């Protein structure tokens, strides 16, 4: 693929330069151009942190689904949605697999394995983002049309979780359709990377644009709208728990924003670098390089604990878990 | 997987779906429990609600509809047995419609051992409000007979009841004092709400108040079910 | 997963002034997903490495 | 105060009863609990095959 | 006048002829016999379909058929060998606290805060359950009702009186009076010629169906008696109260025999039943559990946890195969 021949300044310069003089400019010094040996995150740290992230995710999802399984009789649409979010450990397991195996077995690198590793990761990231908007919509419907009975139906929960899964699957399938196996050109080691051929630079803005507009901004706007309506309805009542439901709405929206914004800002901050809008330097690329890994790990961490902190904010779930702890301490000890 | 056992599972599913359909129809009704003293105005409240829909003692149900909402109101006055043995039956009622007659701060009970009727009503209110079965149930307090109150609030001073009182023998600052005295008996003031209203013989302003309170109660129940919180 | 891995072009700036006999060594890479255009890395002297002009009419002309 | 007279008559009717010793009663209880021990599928568990609710 | 002084003297006479008769104690005897060990039971079936707290339950005369009443206006008749709902009957008043199954297979009784005992015909000529009778005459809530036959039924209510009815004519054939508090529980002798009633004044009375006069009065509890059951022999009975303790009384000795109580239990007893042989005593509790006691030694031989609100009704089959427990969560569990 790449080749070169040392000129050696011999009788034949390997390019016929002795017979050509041309001209030379004045004395020039420094002006470093070639960039190499840039500080990047070690590949072992990513898998190491993701392993314990997966452990936390599976522990929380199991704890939530056990309590759902106990009190299955009196369950509403929101419980169904929260259980639907729990199909994430099964999506993260298939992504940690084919990557741990791929890390211990360098030869099992394949184009069909990179896409399987990235599709499940995208699905795991995107499922809860769209399953939370449905929770907000149900919460609005259960406060607006409070005297009716259809907002409390479980079929609504099943339909909404099916729609959320459909949207997440479509987004992941669109975003994963160009991963492939690429040989690195400074170390000649195979890896997974986007390979669109000649135009494998516009198929890095399309994925990023779809991720930011249809994965961050639209869910944020829908969440804000469906919670502002709920507050504007519940503000006019005389309930004592009026300042207790503001600290849940604000907490949920702020947590989503805080944990999902840095990854998207440190993608524009890199697209600008690729398009020559920020002065390029060796130190610049190397701050973004670790920032991308840190922010992606942050997003995965947030997506791993959505059901646990969504259920712990409620009082019924806290009562159930307190009773479970009492039963666990009374026996087994 | 038999022949005679097939018309024993389809029948069970018939019954199960009929029960499911009947169980969600009874969840759209508002069930209220009426309580009051020996004579506070419960009968006049029942008359005011204008029942529309639909030895032998005990429960006296009363069904009515206001702005597409069915209320069933259970009055327990014919049950003179012990209260602790059946008061836990009404553990899931929407609200309580405790009634107190304002013009009772001068008289005494017919049992004739000289206690104030208002004090006895307060004792019953604080014995019902602070109960194990009713820890989140909202209370709708009616203070009837405000027309008769502005007959005895002039000649008779309040000092007969609540001797510590800061004067001002008029209608205002005396009905508010009674309202505050009744609402001070709440031991869960940060979780449980009390909706007070002076009713007298007002017309179509009592069922509206009950509707306005049960709307908030239903919204609170839905909030608790949702996960908000 | 591996979503922080990026491959970028090595040469920050293109410098002219091709000096005969002031070149210790040369090296030529190839186009690919990492960088679209070809980039040449040459050690003028000692360990310092500079990039010649990617312009074909002069550099690739002799290549 | 006829209620007191009724209570007195009831107490007399109760007091006119005959009583047997506690030892004999305990012996009878033991005899009944022993003579029927094998036929109790709780005191003496029965196999699931026998159990309709297997 | 002073005839009340004649009382508390005949009471002293009874107490005098209640101590010389106590030669030994049931605890002293039954020392040589080995303990039953550890009774481990498994919940074979779970019946669901109610939408509110379950307040009563009765077993079919042979087996396999069970009736349950809940505070949602539904009386449900299940077949227990499967989880099939044989019948569902809607009630006119949703505040019911008792139910019964006739010892013939075709009748059902219900009652509650409406002071009416409703008798339903199960197997009619058209297949739809119809209210066969509505017995009225009580001035308090109905607490218990038991079928003496297909034509007679004994009811106990909060009026502080019991009544022996006549279903065909719907009139009180006999009235049993003497209790000073609400009659909370009632049990029938195996021969249907005597029955015991446990009331809210911490007392129990042994009546006589044919005559209609009280014969013996048993005291010893501290709080209200909520449940009562008869020994299979028919010469003893057991009661449960709010003192978080059960007790065993003897008809012939006219005395208390043993007290089934233990620490870490303060809740109170709602139900009580006996095993077929009469060696186990099952008792439901307000602490969400159900305990099995060795009746001959008063050692807790097992626990039947698995409910989460309360245990209000509890019954044992005629053959003794299974034990049915209802809870305040619309759940019945059948243990074996």
Question: Residues of chain E whose C-beta is under 8 A from some C-beta in B?
Answer: 49, 51-52, 71-74, 79, 82-88, 90, 93, 95, 97, 113-116, 136-141, 158-159, 181-182, 184, 200, 224
E155 contacts: CB under 8 Å, gap ≥ 6 = E111, E117, E135, E138, E142, E144, E145, E162, E163, E165
* CA distance linking residue A83 with residue A68, whole number of Å: 8
| Beta-bridge partners for B36 | B99
Residue A193 is nearest to which of C7, C11, C16, comparing CB atoms? C7
Residue B55 is nearest to which of E52, E72, E136, comparing CB atoms? E136
Sign of CA dihedral E218, E220, E223, E227: negative
Task: Enumerate residues preceding breaks in chain A (C to N > 2.5 Å).
Answer: none
End-to-end CA distance of chain B: 49
* CA distance linking residue E155 with residue E209, whole number of Å: 12
* CA distance linking residue E130 with residue E310, whole number of Å: 32
| Residue C8 touches chain A, beta carbons under 8 Å | yes
H or E stretch covering B205: none
State both tokens at E164. Answer: 């022996």
* CA distance linking residue A130 with residue E235, whole number of Å: 70
3-state helix, strand, coil in chain A (%, to 5): 65, 5, 30
H or E stretch covering E331: strand E331-335
Are the Cβ atoms of B226 and A143 closer than 8 angstroms? yes
Q: Which of E178, E206, E176 is nearest to E193 (CA)?
A: E206
Q: Are A120 and A97 in contact (CB under 8 A)?
A: no
From the centroid of its chain, how far is CA E101?
13
Task: Count the Cβ atoms, other than its own, within 10 Å of residue B22.
Answer: 15
State both tokens at A328. Answer: 């666990």
Q: Which of B191, E188, E75 is nearest to A244 (CA)?
A: B191
| Residue B222 touches chain A, beta carbons under 8 Å | yes
CA distance E111 to chain D (A): 30
Q: Are A211 and C3 in contact (CB under 8 A)?
A: no
* CA distance linking residue A75 with residue A65, whole number of Å: 12
β-sheet with E203-206: strand ranges across = E183-188, E195-199, E203-206, E216-219
* CA distance linking residue E95 with residue B76, whole number of Å: 12
Are the Cβ atoms of E253 and D19 closer than 8 angstroms? yes
Q: Supply the angle between the helices A43-70 and A77-85 in degrees, to the nearest 10.
A: 150
Are the Cβ atoms of B82 and E158 closer than 8 angstroms? yes
Chain D residues whose beta carbon lies within 8 Å of the beta carbon of residue E276: 36, 39-43
Are the Cβ atoms of A99 and C33 closer than 8 angstroms? no
Do A and D touch, counting CB pairs below 8 Å (3 needed)?
no
Phi, psi angle pair for E157, to nearest 5°? -135, 175
Sign of CA dihedral B118, B121, B123, B125: negative
Sign of CA dihedral D36, D37, D42, D48: negative
Are the Cβ atoms of D21 and E253 closer than 8 angstroms? yes
Domain membership of residue A234 (yes or no) is yes
Residue B222 is nearest to which of A143, A238, A310, comparing CB atoms? A143
Angle (nearest 5°) at CA E68 between E62 and E70: 170
Are the Cβ atoms of A33 and C17 closer than 8 angstroms? no
Sign of CA dihedral E61, E63, E64, E69: positive
Cα Dmax for chain B: 86
Q: Are B112 and B119 in contact (CB under 8 A)?
A: no
Q: Which of B224, B29, B36, B28 is nearest to B140 (CA)?
A: B36
Rounding to the nearest 10 degrees, give the CA dihedral for residues E262, E265, E266, E267. Answer: -130
Are the Cβ atoms of D25 and E250 closer than 8 angstroms? yes
DSSP state of B72: E
- Domain region containing A268: 43-285
State both tokens at E38. Answer: 């550890």
Phi, psi angle pair for B225, to nearest 5°? -70, -35
Q: Are E292 and E300 in contact (CB under 8 A)?
A: yes
Q: Which C-chain residues 17-46 have CB contacts (< 8 A) with chain A? A: 17-23, 25-30, 32-34, 36, 41
Q: Which domains does chain C have, with CATH numbers?
A: 25-62 (2.40.50.40)
- Sequence-ordered alpha helix ranges (H) in E141-261: none
| Beta-bridge partners for E303 | E291
CA distance A268 to chain B (A): 35
| Residue D29 touches chain E, beta carbons under 8 Å | yes
Phi, psi angle pair for B63, to nearest 5°? -100, 135
- In which residue are the tokens 């008029």 written? B170
The number of C-beta contacts closer than 8 angstroms across A and B is 65
Residue B16 is nearest to which of E49, E97, E224, comparing CB atoms? E49
Rg (CA), chain A: 26
Domain membership of residue D24 (yes or no) is yes
Phi, psi angle pair for B152, to nearest 5°? -100, -10
Are the Cβ atoms of A147 and B218 closer than 8 angstroms? yes
Task: Count the Cβ atoms, other than its own, within 10 Å of residue E219.
Answer: 11
State both tokens at E300. Answer: 């807790």
Q: Which of A102, A64, A124, A88 is nearest to A310 (CA)?
A: A64
| Residue A73 touches chain B, beta carbons under 8 Å | no
Task: Count the Cβ atoms, other than its own, within 10 Å of residue A49.
Answer: 16
* CA distance linking residue E45 with residue E326, whole number of Å: 12
Q: Are B227 and A311 in contact (CB under 8 A)?
A: yes
- Domain region containing D17: 2-35
Are the Cβ atoms of C11 and A17 closer than 8 angstroms? no
Query: CB burial class (10 A; 0-12, 13-18, 19+) of residue E176?
Result: buried
Query: CB burial class (10 A; 0-12, 13-18, 19+) of residue A241?
Result: middle
- Count of positions (residues) in chain A: 333
Residue A244, domain CATH: 1.20.1070.10
Q: Which of C34, C30, C10, C28 is nearest to A36 (CA)?
A: C10
Task: Enumerate residues preceding breaks in chain D (C to N > 2.5 Å).
Answer: none
DSSP state of B108: B
Q: Is E112 helix (H, G, I), strand (E, B) or coil?
A: strand
Sign of CA dihedral E152, E157, E163, E165: negative
| Residue B181 touches chain E, beta carbons under 8 Å | no
Are the Cβ atoms of E141 and B55 closer than 8 angstroms? no
Q: Are E249 and E270 in contact (CB under 8 A)?
A: no
Domain membership of residue A323 (yes or no) is no
Are the Cβ atoms of E26 and D29 closer than 8 angstroms? yes
Bridging pattern class, strands B30-34 and B95-96 = parallel
Are the Cβ atoms of D4 and E17 closer than 8 angstroms? no
Q: Supply the angle between the helices A154-175 and A77-85 in degrees, to the nearest 10.
A: 30
- Count of positions (residues) in chain C: 63
Interface test with B, best of E45, E78, E115 (most B CBs within 10 A): E115
CA distances from B188 to A256, B128, B132 (A): 34, 13, 12
Q: Are E33 and D35 in contact (CB under 8 A)?
A: no
Are the Cβ atoms of E44 and D53 closer than 8 angstroms? yes
| Beta-bridge partners for B60 | B75
Domain membership of residue D13 (yes or no) is yes
C22 contacts: CB under 8 Å, gap ≥ 6 = A24, C44, C45
Task: Count the Cβ atoms, other than its own, within 10 Å of residue A281.
Answer: 13
Q: Is B19 helix (H, G, I), strand (E, B) or coil?
A: helix
* CA distance linking residue A179 with residue A193, whole number of Å: 6
Chain A residues whose beta carbon lies within 8 Å of the beta carbon of residue C6: 270, 289, 292
Q: Which of B204, B207, B179 is nearest to B194 (CA)?
A: B179
Binding site for Mg(2+): what residues of B are annotated? 43, 56
CA distances from E211 to A55, B165, E6, E176, E214 (A): 75, 64, 26, 10, 9
**CATH 3.50.50.60: does it fit domain B29-207?**
no
Chain E residues whose beta carbon lies within 8 Å of the beta carbon of residue D31: none
Domain membership of residue D30 (yes or no) is yes
Is the backbone of residue E149 left (phi > 0), alpha (psi -120 to 50) or beta?
Answer: beta
* CA distance linking residue A215 with residue A260, whole number of Å: 10
Q: Are E254 and E261 in contact (CB under 8 A)?
A: no
* CA distance linking residue B4 with residue E235, whole number of Å: 44
SS3 of A70-138? HCCCCCCHHHHHHHHHCCCHHHHHHHHCCCHHHHHCHHHCCHHHHHHHHHHHHHHHHHHHHHHHHHHHH
Q: Which chains touch D (3 or more CB pairs under 8 A)?
A: E
Q: Are E31 and D26 in contact (CB under 8 A)?
A: no
Q: Which of A9, A273, A38 is nearest to C42 (CA)?
A: A9
DSSP A151-220: GG-HHHHHHHHHHHHHHHHHHHHHHTTTEEEEE-TTT--EEEEE--GGGTTTTTHHHHHHHHIIIIIHHH
Residue B28 is nearest to which of A149, A240, A241, comparing CB atoms? A149
Domain membership of residue A196 (yes or no) is yes
Q: Which of C34, B175, B57, A24 is nearest to E95 (CA)?
A: B57
Chain A residues whose beta carbon lies within 8 Å of the beta carbon of residue B224: 315-316
Chain C residues whose beta carbon lies within 8 Å of the beta carbon of residue A99: 1-2
Q: Are E49 and E56 in contact (CB under 8 A)?
A: no
Are the Cβ atoms of B219 and A234 closer than 8 angstroms? yes
* CA distance linking residue C5 with residue A117, whole number of Å: 14
* CA distance linking residue E67 with residue E323, whole number of Å: 14
Is the backbone of residue E127 left (phi > 0), alpha (psi -120 to 50) or beta?
Answer: left
Binding site for GTP: what residues of B are annotated? 39-44, 55-56, 75-79, 144-147, 201
State both tokens at B87. Answer: 């008061």
Is the backbone of residue E210 left (phi > 0), alpha (psi -120 to 50) or beta?
Answer: alpha
Entry resolution (Å) = 3.0
- Sequence-ordered alpha helix ranges (H) in chain E: 3-6, 10-16
Domain ranges of chain B: 29-207
Q: Is A292 helix (H, G, I), strand (E, B) or coil?
A: helix
| Residue A319 touches chain B, beta carbons under 8 Å | no
Residue A149 is nearest to which of B24, B69, B227, comparing CB atoms? B24
Domain membership of residue D25 (yes or no) is yes
* CA distance linking residue E284 with residue E57, whole number of Å: 13
Q: Is B183 helix (H, G, I), strand (E, B) or coil?
A: helix
SS3 of chain D? CHHHHHHHHHHHHHHCCCCCCHHHHHHHHHHHHHHCCCCCCCCCCCCCCCCCCC
Experimental technique, in short, is: cryo-EM
* CA distance linking residue E211 with residue E196, whole number of Å: 14
Bridging pattern class, strands E183-188 and E174-176 = unpaired
Q: Are B193 and B214 in contact (CB under 8 A)?
A: no
State both tokens at E206. Answer: 């042994």
State both tokens at B181. Answer: 């005295």
Domain membership of residue D46 (yes or no) is no
Q: Which E-chain residues 82-121 have CB contacts (< 8 A) with chain D? A: none
Angle (nearest 5°) at CA B104 between B100 and B107: 145
CA distance B4 to chain E (A): 14
The domain total for chain D is 1
Is the backbone of residue E118 left (phi > 0), alpha (psi -120 to 50) or beta?
Answer: beta
End-to-end CA distance of chain C: 41
From the centroid of its chain, how far is CA B225?
23
* CA distance linking residue A304 with residue B74, whole number of Å: 50
* CA distance linking residue B42 with residue B30, whole number of Å: 18
Do B and A touch, counting CB pairs below 8 Å (3 needed)?
yes
Q: Are E98 and E80 in contact (CB under 8 A)?
A: no
B167 contacts: CB under 8 Å, gap ≥ 6 = none
Are the Cβ atoms of C7 and A184 closer than 8 angstroms? yes
CA distances from A34 to A276, C13, C19, C24, C52 (A): 16, 8, 18, 15, 11
CA distance E247 to chain B (A): 21
| Residue A201 touches chain C, beta carbons under 8 Å | yes
The domain total for chain A is 1
């Amino acid at each position: 693929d790449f080749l070169t021949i040392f000129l050696d300044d011999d009788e034949s310069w390997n390019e016929t330069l002795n017979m050509s003089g041309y001209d030379y400019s004045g004395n020039f010094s420094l002006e470093v151009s070639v960039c190499e040996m840039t500080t990047v995150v070690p590949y072992t740290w990513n898998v190491g942190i993701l392993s314990l992230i997966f452990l936390i995710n599976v522990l929380g999802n199991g704890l939530v689904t056990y309590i759902f399984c106990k009190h299955r009789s009196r369950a509403g649409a929101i419980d169904i949605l929260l259980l639907g979010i729990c199909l994430n450990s099964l999506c993260l397991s298939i992504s940690l697999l084919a990557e741990v195996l791929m890390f211990l077995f360098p030869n099992i690198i394949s184009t069909g394995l990179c896409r399987l590793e990235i599709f499940f990761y995208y699905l795991y990231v995107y499922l809860d983002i769209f399953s939370v908007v449905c929770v907000s919509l149900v919460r609005y419907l259960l406060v607006a049309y409070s005297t009716r009975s259809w907002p409390k139906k479980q079929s609504l929960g099943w339909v909404l979780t099916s729609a959320a899964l459909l949207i997440a699957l479509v987004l992941s399938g669109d975003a994963c359709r160009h991963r492939s196996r690429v040989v690195d050109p400074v170390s000649k080691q195979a890896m997974c990377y986007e390979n669109a051929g000649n135009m494998t630079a516009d198929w890095r803005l399309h994925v990023r644009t779809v991720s930011v507009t249809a994965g961050f901004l639209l869910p944020l706007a829908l969440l804000i709208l469906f919670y502002a309506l709920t507050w504007c309805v519940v503000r006019r009542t005389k309930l004592q728990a009026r300042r207790k439901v503001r600290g849940v709405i604000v907490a949920v929206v702020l947590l989503f924003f805080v944990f999902c914004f840095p990854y998207h800002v440190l993608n524009l901050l890199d697209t600008l670098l690729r398009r020559r809008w920020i002065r390029d330097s060796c130190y610049t690329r190397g701050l973004i390089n670790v920032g991308l890994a840190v922010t992606s790990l942050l997003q995965a961490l947030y997506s791993a604990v959505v059901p646990l902190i969504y259920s712990c904010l409620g009082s019924l779930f806290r009562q159930r878990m307190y009773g479970l702890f009492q039963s666990l301490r009374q026996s087994f000890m | 997987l038999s022949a005679e056992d097939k018309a024993a599972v389809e029948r069970s599913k018939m019954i199960d779906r009929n029960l499911r359909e009947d169980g969600e129809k009874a969840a759209r009704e508002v069930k209220l429990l009426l309580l009051g003293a020996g004579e506070s105005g419960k009968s006049t409240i029942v008359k005011q609600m204008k029942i529309i829909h639909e030895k032998t003692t005990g429960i006296v149900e009363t069904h009515f509809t206001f702005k597409d909402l069915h209320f069933k109101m259970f009055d327990v006055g014919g049950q003179r047995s012990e209260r602790k043995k059946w008061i836990h039956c009404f553990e899931g009622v929407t609200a309580i419609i405790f009634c107190v007659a304002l013009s009772d701060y001068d008289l005494v009970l017919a049992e004739d051992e000289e206690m104030n009727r208002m004090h006895e009503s307060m004792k019953l209110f604080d014995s019902i409000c602070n109960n194990k079965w009713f820890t989140d149930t909202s209370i709708i307090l009616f203070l009837n007979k405000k027309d008769l109150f502005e007959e005895k609030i002039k000649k008779s001073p309040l000092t007969i009841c609540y001797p510590e009182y800061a004067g001002s023998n008029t209608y205002e600052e005396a009905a508010a004092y009674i309202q505050c005295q009744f609402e001070d008996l709440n031991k869960r003031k940060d979780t449980k709400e009390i909706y007070t209203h002076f009713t007298c013989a007002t017309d179509t302003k009592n069922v509206q108040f009950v509707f306005d309170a049960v709307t908030d109660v239903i919204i609170k129940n839905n909030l608790k079910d949702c996960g908000l919180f | 997963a591996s979503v922080a891995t990026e491959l970028r072009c090595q040469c920050l700036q293109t410098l002219q002034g091709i000096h005969p006999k002031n070149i210790q060594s040369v090296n030529v890479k190839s186009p690919g997903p990492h960088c679209a255009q070809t980039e040449v890395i040459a050690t003028l002297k000692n360990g310092r490495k500079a990039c010649l002009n990617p312009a074909s009419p002069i550099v690739k002309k002799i290549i | 105060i006829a209620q007191a007279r009724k209570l007195v008559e009831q107490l007399k009717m109760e007091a006119n009863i005959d009583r047997i010793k506690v030892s004999k009663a305990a012996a009878d209880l033991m005899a009944y609990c022993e003579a029927h021990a094998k036929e109790d599928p709780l005191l003496t568990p029965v196999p699931a095959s026998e159990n309709p609710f297997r | 006048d002073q005839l009340r002084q004649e009382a508390e003297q005949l009471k002293n006479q009874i107490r005098d002829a209640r101590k010389a008769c106590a030669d030994a104690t049931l605890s002293q005897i039954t020392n040589n016999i080995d303990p039953v060990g550890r009774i481990q039971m498994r919940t074979r079936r779970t019946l669901r379909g109610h939408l509110a707290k379950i307040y009563a339950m009765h077993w079919g005369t042979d087996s396999r058929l069970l009736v349950s009443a809940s505070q949602d206006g539904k009386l449900i008749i299940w077949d227990s060998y499967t989880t099939n709902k044989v019948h569902a009957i809607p009630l006119r008043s949703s505040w019911v606290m008792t139910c019964a199954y006739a010892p013939s297979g075709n009748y059902v009784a219900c009652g509650g805060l409406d002071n009416i005992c409703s008798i339903y015909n199960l197997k009619t000529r058209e297949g739809n359950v119809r209210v066969s009778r509505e017995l009225a005459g009580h001035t308090g809530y109905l607490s218990c009702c038991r079928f003496l036959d297909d034509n007679q039924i004994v009811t106990s209510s909060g009026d502080t009186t019991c009544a022996l009815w006549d279903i065909e004519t719907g009139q009180q054939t006999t009235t049993f009076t003497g209790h000073t508090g609400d009659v909370m529980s009632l049990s029938l002798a195996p021969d249907t010629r005597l029955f015991v009633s446990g009331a809210c004044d911490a007392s129990a009375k042994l009546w006589d169906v044919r005559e209609g006069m009280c014969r013996q009065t048993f005291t010893g509890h501290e709080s209200d008696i909520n449940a009562i059951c008869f020994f299979p022999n028919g010469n003893a009975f057991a009661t449960g109260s709010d003192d978080a303790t059960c007790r065993l009384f003897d008809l012939r000795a006219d005395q208390e025999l043993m007290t089934y109580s233990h620490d870490n239990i303060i809740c109170g007893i709602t139900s009580v039943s006996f095993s077929k042989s009469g060696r186990l005593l099952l008792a439901g509790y307000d602490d969400f559990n159900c305990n099995v006691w060795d009746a001959l030694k008063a050692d807790r031989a097992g626990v039947l946890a698995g409910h989460d609100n309360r245990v209000s009704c509890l019954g044992v089959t005629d053959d003794g195969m299974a034990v049915a427990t209802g809870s305040w969560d619309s759940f019945l569990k059948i243990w074996n």
